Amino acid sequence: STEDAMTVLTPLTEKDYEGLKRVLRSLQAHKMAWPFLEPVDPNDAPDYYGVIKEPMDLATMEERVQRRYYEKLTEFVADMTKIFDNCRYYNPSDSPFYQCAEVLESFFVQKLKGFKASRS
Ligand SMILES: CN(C)CCc1ccc(Nc2cnn(C)c(=O)c2Cl)cc1
Numbered sequence: 570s571t572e573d574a575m576t577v578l579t580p581l582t583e584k585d586y587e588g589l590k591r592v593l594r595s596l597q598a599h600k601m602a603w604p605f606l607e608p609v610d611p612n613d614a615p616d617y618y619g620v621i622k623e624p625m626d627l628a629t630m631e632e633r634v635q636r637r638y639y640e641k642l643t644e645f646v647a648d649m650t651k652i653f654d655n656c657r658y659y660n661p662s663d664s665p666f667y668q669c670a671e672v673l674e675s676f677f678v679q680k681l682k683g684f685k686a687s688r689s
Pocket residue numbers: 603604605609610613614617655656659660666
């Protein structure tokens with residue numbers, strides 16, 4: 570669609586980056602974001618970094634947003650998706666972390682759709 574191709578191809582502008590920061594800030598304020606605010610502490614999960622190839626967290630994405638690391642929205646969505654995919658890969662489905670990933674990913678999808686709608 571218009572938004573799917575924009576998402577893949579349209580370079581992110583400074584104006585886009587205001588929208589990206591708003592989305593990230595709203596995730597960081599969400600009640601269910603607590604497991605994802607900061608990198609996974611190895612002492613919470615001793616085998617985590619031997620298993621998870623590309624860790625991700627909201628503080629690392631905040632740094633990348635500040636530095637204009639992302640050229641396309643697809644790259645931003647991929648980093649965010651890693652947070653939730655890593656969590657569901659490593660944890661059982663009845664884990665509170667896994668449940669937080671399900672709730673926060675649905676919230677991110679709601680916010681991401683709003684952001685894509687306003688790029689016009
Ligand atoms: C040092 N801490 C006890 C602080 C509390 C805390 C912070 C973040 C997490 N986040 C984790 C942890 N372990 N694993 C396997 C995960 O997947 C995730 Cl998302 C947990 C506790």
